[PDB]
């Protein structure tokens, strides 16, 4: 299928025991759709101060459309030294692996794969 529908449990910064996906644009982007594959990605909201606690590349997800079944649309953009890998719409979050934080929420999503 081009889409998927995921529900992303969103984890709080403080929280968050691996703080990126990689070391360049290509293997956080890779492991990032890996993770969205497996279930085991995080969704962190962005605030001010949330960005400088985490690891780039960041990977983010964007609105891709203004939400089939409540799933909003998305799909993922990178980000390395203030430069983005990628062209979409409004930040609903930055990705994370998951490897078991208790999540405060849950952002359901509808990922173009």
Request: aromatic residues 4%; contains cysteine.
């Amino acid at each position: 299928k081009t889409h998927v529908q995921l529900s992303l449990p969103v984890l709080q910064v403080r929280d968050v025991l691996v703080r990126g996906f990689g070391d360049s644009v290509e293997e956080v982007l890779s492991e990032a759709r890996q993770h969205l594959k497996d279930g085991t990605c995080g969704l962190v909201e962005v605030e001010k101060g949330v960005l400088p606690q985490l690891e780039q590349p960041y990977v983010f997800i964007k609105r891709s459309d203004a939400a089939p079944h409540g799933h909003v649309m998305v799909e993922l953009v990178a980000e390395l030294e203030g430069i983005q890998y990628g062209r979409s719409g409004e930040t609903l979050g930055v990705l994370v692996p998951h490897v078991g934080e208790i999540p405060v929420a849950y952002r359901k999503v509808l990922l173009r794969k």
